[model samples]
Target chain A: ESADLRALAKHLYDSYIKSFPLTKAKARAILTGKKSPFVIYDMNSLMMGEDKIKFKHKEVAIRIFQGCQFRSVEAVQEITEYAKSIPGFVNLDLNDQVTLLKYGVHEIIYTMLASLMNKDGVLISEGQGFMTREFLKSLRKPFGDFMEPKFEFAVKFNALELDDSDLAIFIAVIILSGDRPGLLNVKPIEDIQDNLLQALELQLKLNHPESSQLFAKLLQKMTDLRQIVTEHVQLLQVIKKTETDMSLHPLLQEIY
Target chain B: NPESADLRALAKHLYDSYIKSFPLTKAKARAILTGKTTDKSPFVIYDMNSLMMGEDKIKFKHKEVAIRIFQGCQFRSVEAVQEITEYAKSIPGFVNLDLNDQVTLLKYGVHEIIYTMLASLMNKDGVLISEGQGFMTREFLKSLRKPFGDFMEPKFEFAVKFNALELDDSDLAIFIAVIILSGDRPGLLNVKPIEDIQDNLLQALELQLKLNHPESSQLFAKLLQKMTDLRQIVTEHVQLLQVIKKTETDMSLHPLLQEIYKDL
Candidate 1:
């Protein structure tokens, strides 16, 4: 049953890429190259019954964490609210609880993709409370080091800690938001010089996944729109050229 | 004693100078006392006998007479003719009368109107040149005072009576110059031509003495000169009128030129 959680995580990750094919290429590359395996958890523990039933498949719980990480801060807030509705999930220390709800979900998604594999020997547990600290510790090496839970620093820093992948995400976000040129303060002319610079700063701050998606779509659309404008500009040039030719023809006749 | 003697000698020197400065000649002094030589020209009132006969001969018998025939014809009354001829001879330059005495004689009908009229023609433009008040020269208007009344009445009567004919040129010029110069001042009987004259006629006139006087020559000469001046002045006035008409688009110049031509 514990191995089943790992298998579910793998399947979910693969399905996420395949379902959204446009995103599949970028996501697969990023996942394959990750330096460390990550984990996910369902902070609400809702898969266990409302009664104190323990659940197996720890990996499935953690994959939920990774799914929440891909979301914006505003999305984190929403998932945290969902966790509060579960019976015992509210009983955890508030800060640790928030960390589990937010960053904990995203880490699971990353690590599972990087390292964790499905196997038959893994035990599945039931009950509202399943894995204790000892249980999690015993499986640490094979599952990949599940350290004593510190704060999930990456999620807190995710919006600010921009990298090339983040840059792509940020650019996509602003474009999808329908931001006019210079609205993001990332003047493209200033950001790129002969395409020499690799570190593109996240010039805009955004909180909603919707904004990121909107800006991403706008950037894609402008390329087509620009081609239409170019054709009109060429048409005007032809008109001016014909007018000049007409005038010169008359003068040439006069010369003859 | 010395100061009194100097004062006495000074008084004596002034008295001697005053005596030497007397206005009286020795002969005048004797006349003033004894009344021997009269201190004046003789007042010999010549009878009009010689001048009257001369005028009568000119009127009745003389051919090539300077006096116009009409003039001789106008004075049909013997007394009026004789008196007017007598008045002409009595004028100072006509006889020996001094200018002051001539003024007195002219007060009587002691001068001939015809002769006086002829004298006016001689002085024509020369009147202005000589600084003598020109023709109709005032040398004596007193002589004409009686005739002037008759002259003015007949002119009005003729103008009213015979409005068909404009006043004759001589009568017109005489009446106009008289009316104008007298209007200027009563004392000036020698009236010069007024604004009515024009240039060509004035030029032709200036040559009148060289050219023989035509019949009614003096009157004709005067009319010609006055008309010449009238034409010259009127033509200039017309040219100016043309310019004014061009600018103002008024049509008053034709009538104005016609009215001025009647003086011709």
Candidate 2:
């Protein structure tokens, strides 16, 4: 039963790679923190018009939060749609489909972030911008604390040096996690996740002959992704507690 | 065959029994076990000042306590693993597997199962350790002085939020079974049979969660999600060991831990 599912998962993963080609330059920009022309635009000085309006730190923090959210939403939707294309995924009930996407999206987003990450930090704007660990910490209180651990995990995850193919299967595993809160058909979803995990383990063995630990390392990354997303949820809770004025996107609010 | 209610009762009984055997908190257990007067506590409290002052008696006492605590934890883990082994045997399809395959599953999956049980012992503060005799505060753990406290950092970090999910014993018993039967553990001879057992257990778990906590619609998924979280805790733990091996020349890990960390 799982052999056929494994092949289909690989096919679906390959299709995703062809659809979203991560260029070497873009990957480098995302992984290694390279300053780009867009970094200037993020500065508060540039946002102020000729009238020279001085934005408060809170305003700057919100803007940065919004920018990160916008990018995350776009990435999440792309992957979620790609997930919907997989044969097993489409077989799920409509409500299960939505519940999986709602709970699983952030995990997928962080997995993608792991690919673009390196020892330095992650790239913010599709390789057009860079965010270093130090600079990110300098942002306002909760906003700064929120992303630091993610960068920390990303840096460690990047140490494994998995190619895009490994990440494709990993993303599928994250989306198909049977444990998401409201899954109606867990047996089917778990079967699918099991198939993908087996496929991923086999691929890792073939891809990295020198390192026997590669398979374990990749599995560990899945755990790291879960932890990162959990912390992200906690950060959202803090924001909801402190910033009553800030409005969360309906999708984001609903998922949390 | 046991009905759902029977299974539920069994799960709760297993959880409660495990807690009774291994009470992790310090304050209550110490008072009960030693019958020591409150003013004259046998527990050694170490901070930066006492650590640097180098009171050999206190240091030796603390080290003795640490070693004893570590050994007791290992023994408790072995006991827990034994209970889980018996629990799996009682499940319908689990014991039918080849004895070797059953061993393989237990070998690779025990740490994951152990961490899942450890989650129940945690709270927002930190995990209770030494069977209610000593409380390892999270802050103290993070700042722990070398070789001794380093191993616990990731476990504590993972346990705090895992506790936040607030899964009941009924939910956890099935989840632990799922972890033991996972098909993804490396070096399994035949994954299909293992996955078959896993699939059935997952169904039972989902149904039980619904019956057990019908009002909390998301409970099932949340419990499953914690498995991923538990895996991360174990991974980080291995990573910490790797770091210790590279940097801390004088430090030594238990042979069993070294074996586990080698592959992880």
Candidate 3:
């Protein structure tokens, strides 16, 4: 049992952690990437339009927010690429691979957001600077309001003594869950996910033997992450209605 | 915001009706190459020229071949109306209107919606999709000479321009909603709430386009103009149908497009 988990663990780590850029250095890659500055709502670029200029703060915020959405899309594509490197991910039926990622990517994104966040705000543009929670709040309600719960979650989550390698397995475990709604091959995906889950347990126990409840706490955070996305959609639903001129990314359109 | 909240709930139902119910495209193309059965495939097209290649041309004359593809289009359009009905009823303000007005919106708007989907399945070369399995060619489609030509070409142009936008499924959902809930539809007994829903849908679509096409500065203005052209084209389409519809070539008036044509 430990033998298979060890093999799974090694493959998973090598696949995700080795190439996964955790530092500000790799952040520069996504920045080569988009050189998006720490844009604020009130700040207007002379290049922008008068029509888009109407809602001032909200307009810029929406543009900035939509700009960030593509990075998630690019990351989702990266995650898709990384999945191929590991064991068993390729064994699932083709459409099932799509289904798992469709439901799984945001959970992975929200979980990883903890990396850049602190008590004040999040880092942006390869450490260009942090955009404070207060500045985001200044743009619009619900838009500003949406991040608080995630920020809180990240704050609590960081308290756990996990590192980059732990997260590599963690995201794989998230992606391979058999419970995604449209999945075609349930039992086979479950078997692979179970191996990942077992390895996660072994891995966590190895690093933090004193923290007996860490795995259970992580599962609870998954539930919390789900509700966060749900609430975000609910907020977005109203925003979409009133803010008619605001556009959505094709990627976010698919996810939402 | 309260009203917007209801719009939110309705928006989800509308997308559910569209995304879940609509037949998706891609995969084959060969009768030029050209459901459920209709939605499952591309619509295969035959002009008198192509139909003449087969023995089926042995039985029919000019009007007959013209009517055959017309009937094929009608059958597919009628099949599409089921999901469109699902989409229409899900608009937040739709139920608040008088019943006749609701019927009038569908009466006027159904063909427009079909034409939009036709645009999605078509290209600059003028081919259109049927179900998911069949297809049609623009050249063979031109066989009708005048009847299909007059209205068909105009609508084809509309779809071609609209298709160039590269809209994904979600954008098309609201785009279709705005078209269906139009206030200007000829016989609407209550225009008030229809435009209200239309206006909200327009905003959602505007915001969506803005979000999606951030750098295409005047794209929204351009798309707004496309709607006017669409209405004008549909008007000309209905006018041409009425021109000879009362007496000449009344055979194609059997069903499906028959009732909708009568309402027009």
Candidate 4:
């Protein structure tokens, strides 16, 4: 790899991915940074080494998709801890805080996917190596199509150029959505959301002084996340019909 | 199954595993100290004479008794966390849930659990064990300089009322599970499963309570109300602790206080 692209990936990780509060990121770095697990990062390294799974097989494909589900479930739990750390989010009515976190975590999971993504594909966890965009698309209908929009979302969201610190506040911006259905005290949540969105803008000015469209663009991306989730739920529902033997993890079923 | 035997099975398992993690309670602490002949708790109420002992006992160890008391709770919390963890590990669906979820549950759950378990270590006479040792008067605790001196009173206050419920290790073990597994905990990854777990816990507790208090039809229903009061005490004390700790009240300050105030 050229140094710039490598540095880009490296810097992006330390800035955003490393700053991710979740132990999931460390769990990956441990697997990836260690020798045997290290050996699996590149497809060439994995296929050249002994650990590669056959992508064509249904069982193998289903396992790969389900592993991501396991990661998603774990990530949301970490985000909850992260959410409580914020003073504004923590101060919200206890019931409203749960309501916000319940809906907001979905958007966060998608935003975090940008951490593992490149234009081509994403880095999956454990000893399993990088998965290409197409290889995932090649699996049976539901398994193959399971995460295409999110893959698509990550690539586009990557272009928005936010990092962990920005994402940290940006995440708070999403989590305190007054739009949450069960909110008991709506006005306070809206006020908190403004302070957070204002906080995001203040940071944006310092980091990208020349950029004007960034604010509106971040909003659209926030708006667009719902679409990806909507599609994901729909595609995910028929997995039993398409791949009868595949099972949803209980937590995943709860989240979905 | 019968009375949601699945609920019974999970509850039974929670209590059984909790036995592994259960701490020696204050009530029993005295039993051992008294050579097992005493269920009668011993305490001296805080009177004009309580601090008189501190006064004559060479001006006391620390004038910052209020903060010191908080530290004592903090110190006791150190071991309580371990026991909580041991109990947490055995929660039926806990291992499968996310780690952060377990951690958050533990975080919210511990203070509340400790407040409940205070009943075991406390007495009807408005006295509490000084960290499993001899008793201290609730009146003495209320006399500490900070408003939080009164913080000790609410827990002590609730302990007597809750203790009247006549629950034992088994009832409390199930109760503790429901408190920790409260799916409504802020920022839970998946609320429904935790909700489901809590339901199972509550069912098991209901069956167990019915067996214990045949005369008490609404015993299970009443425990739910205690959960409400428990939340209030926890919320008040959580901030009293959080704001105090972050603002700087380390025990190391005690050395300085000794040099500055004790000599004066």
Candidate 5:
């Protein structure tokens, strides 16, 4: 009965992967052991903005904050578009839909980040850019704390070896979570999430017949996602308190 | 000195209330608590050979009883949270917080506290549930149905390691208080006050650990790290409930559990 839904999910995922032309090429290059062509900004320069002594520290902090916001917003828009293609997602009430995205987008972003991650850390800019775990720590004080834990989680999650199809459904499960605060129509959203969970489990069963534990392990990743996101928000509060001159992007502030 | 004595009295009072409301023999519980050997297993052991003999001949009664026992464990766990919630309210500054902030702290923080308590019912082995009447073996817990049995594995994994720390009742009382008064939970209206309370509790807990476990210098930091471990365990727990509610049509979950998992 759910084979059709699974197929649709896989198809949607294939299209999503194809949508980002640079990502696809970069992922292939990384798999083939070729060095990436793009250049990452030197850590010191990015961490220390225009050096007018008085403005330097705060300026550098704001730049780091903006970089995180740019990546997060890009991921959120990609996920929002992908979610719209899911069968029941766009059908949800507009407010309920936005509520789910607002609360859940960070989780989905981190989950996607898992695919780009390896034991070292996540690859960025189509494999041309890489962030070492320690380098991420040296970015900024509290904000550095945010990315490190997420990479820690990502490394562990990637160990499961889930393919893109599995990740697509997993991201859908996170998006359709009915427990997001201020959900107006929880029942319908839960219905969508429930169906996705059942389908994901069934797909896992067929895909990984030798391993019975994969389904539960994947579900458990959602919990890790929640914890990391919670900690990320807490870190954001610290950044807000300590760096008053920093201007947050409207979208980032709205979701926070 | 009297202040320390009062904290001891409260710890003893809470432990007694917990034991009286729960249904385990004192001797068995003491063994579990003290990490001592016992001839009698605290849990009812099932004979697999007979139970697997014939599918049709098997009695649904045992499964029914097991489910009932599971529900009972769930009920008692919620009660334990309520008792702790009430205890927090009685603290001098806890009730003085804005009513909304108090509710927010309890909402996000209760599961971590529950997992902390559950750690006491565990040892190197799996957890002792149903008031220590049922000792579910680790392998047995993993063998059950999806999402149902799946939920217990991570918790047992966590409990076994946490129990290895062997924190006594006094450390646990102050630690649980810290979990309740956590200032880091999202959407806190005034984090400073809550952070203040949490800092004081942390200092008190550190002092108690120093006095009680004189040889163990890192015990305080180690105990604090377990709160992070507890959070991960409860996160897995809530995720499991989300799966169960969506997938298990025949299973009837308790309302309070539903409330907790749904973040109500």
Candidate 6:
């Protein structure tokens, strides 16, 4: 290829990958940042945790990775809203609407861990899979009503209610605090659930600091979530293996 | 053994006779008999009981059908049906005909419309000619000429997919005509590579002068120039990515590029 074409190809590739919200370097900065609105990095304190998953340097690495993803989602949401609200924004037409919506959703979620981190930061709707009550509310505020004329509505598709996979991830992070599993046990899951609900209330009411703290705590939890996820990953593997083996039988020779 | 041999000879003779008497050519007969061909015209057979009994028929939503009277013709099941089906494929404006003709055909209990719909689908096979050797125009070029974000968005690779669904050759031709008329996006050629252009996009002043569509071209050219400025504002993104990567790689690269790549 000519240098120009090669350059273009390289530039386009770079552009495509960079368009993704999270990458290795991005994850680190997010984990280490102290004053982020979404993720608070406390690298020194993070290092002090004694989880096997977080053993020495391994702990800080994954926390930063998780934090990076959370930050990316916030950035994407902000940019998308900004695009929609541009002055004299006439309808993008059905074609443009579909294109933008599809790409927007893909970019928001394609950074797998980043998407989860963002999901983690929000108040998940009860008995709904991947639907964050808090995040949806934020979208409505920024983009107007869901039933607005001539606009695409955000449809809930994967409403799997709190699935074991995500729960496992959360538990893994908690377990990563090895010796300090006490930290995981310190606050009941109910308290965190209540905190999530309260945070949603603050956001709906536009309460600033409470909402800010809500996001901060969410980020804080993410710091150890990898530990929890890593530990449970083994348990999940065993379950998967057992299920796979059991599925291969012809009527299982009458269980009774 | 004598009786079985006699039966086999009779079967072979009948098959040969049927193939020879078929109205369409070997290929056409094969296509129609195998249900790979479509009929597109507006005609009804007279002898069918459904039409004679005046049965109600379903109609099409988006198109109308037209009817014409022909000689009261004698019908042979295999030959006449195949001939009519082949004739329908050649009719112009057949796919866009009225629903009344469609109803009339349905009343005859002859499913020429179903055949037309099928043939229309077969006609859209992107290969050129009835067989191989030549390439079939996908008629996708015009689809790509459509403005971005349509049902068939005007994307290069995407147009090929959309055109594959088109059944009517006339519609394909129309699509091609539209593309030829419209050509490329107004300022596409002027778009420079991102590295060379520090700003948003490029200017098409010379292009407008050459095309003689100066007023409209000038307006679009200026718009392109303004959008280019947004590219410069992405410094924050470069800075963010750099720092994150460095932190991942133990801060190996120089501090300046590292800082520039931090966040957007």
Best by DockQ: 2
TM-score, one value per model: 0.13, 0.49, 0.43, 0.43, 0.49, 0.20
Q: Candidate 3's residue-wise lDDT over A74-153, tens digit each? A: 67877888777768788889999999888888888887777767656665543444456666666666577767777877
- Candidate 2's C-alpha runs over 4 A off are A1-10, A18-25, A29-37, A40-58, A248-256, B1-264
Assess candidate 5 and give its lDDT: 0.65
Better of 3 and 6 by TM-score: 3
Candidate 2 TM-score for chain A: 0.81
Q: Kindly list the per-residue Cα lDDT of model 5 for residues A1-256, writing each as its tens digit.
A: 7767677677666766754344434464574466343323455533332231212113644665565576776777888888888788888999998998898888887887777766555565445455566666666566567667877787677667777667777778778876577888888886777677666767777778865336645664565777788878878778778777776557756753
Whole-structure CA lDDT of model 2: 0.63
Estimate, for each residue in B1-264, the C-alpha lDDT of model 3 and write its tens digit: 676565555556666667666766322222232332343343344544455543341322224766666666666677778778877877777877899998888887887777777676676555544443344566667656566655467777777668666676666787788778876566777776776677677656656666677865434434543564555566677777676566465655546566777856
Tens-place lDDT per residue, model 1, A21-90, is 3242333343344332222133243444322442221343233222222332333343344344322334
User: How would the docking of model 5 be graded?
Assistant: incorrect
Candidates 2 and 5 compared: the better one by TM-score is 2
Give candidate 1 misplaced runs (Cα > 4 Å). Answer: A1-108, A111-135, A138-203, A206-256, B1-264
Q: What are the per-model DockQ values? A: 0.00, 0.09, 0.01, 0.01, 0.02, 0.01
| TM-score of model 6 vs. true structure | 0.20
Best by TM-score: 2
Clashes of 5: 1
List all candidate RMSDs to the true structure: 59.7, 16.0, 18.9, 22.0, 20.6, 29.5
How does each model score on lDDT?
0.28, 0.63, 0.65, 0.64, 0.65, 0.27
**Number of clashes found in candidate 4:** 1
Give one digit per residue, the lDDT tens place, for model 6 in A1-256.
2343233333323433344334324333443342232221233333333221232112333333233334445545543443343221124343443344333332223223332333223211111112222333333221222112111111111121222222222221221221122222322322332332332323322333322222222222232232233333444355446533223235422320
Across B1-264, the per-residue lDDT of candidate 4 in tens digits comes to 675677668767877877778666544643543445554444343654553453443222223656655655555665676687788778888777888788767766776787887777776445434433345667677777666567788787788778877787878888888778876465578766776666567667767887778776346645654665676676567555555556655543323222222212
Q: Global CA lDDT of candidate 4, please? A: 0.64
lDDT of 5 at A87: 81
Error of 5 at A137 (Å): 1.7
Query: Model 6 chain B, poorest ten-residue lDDT window?
Result: B62-71
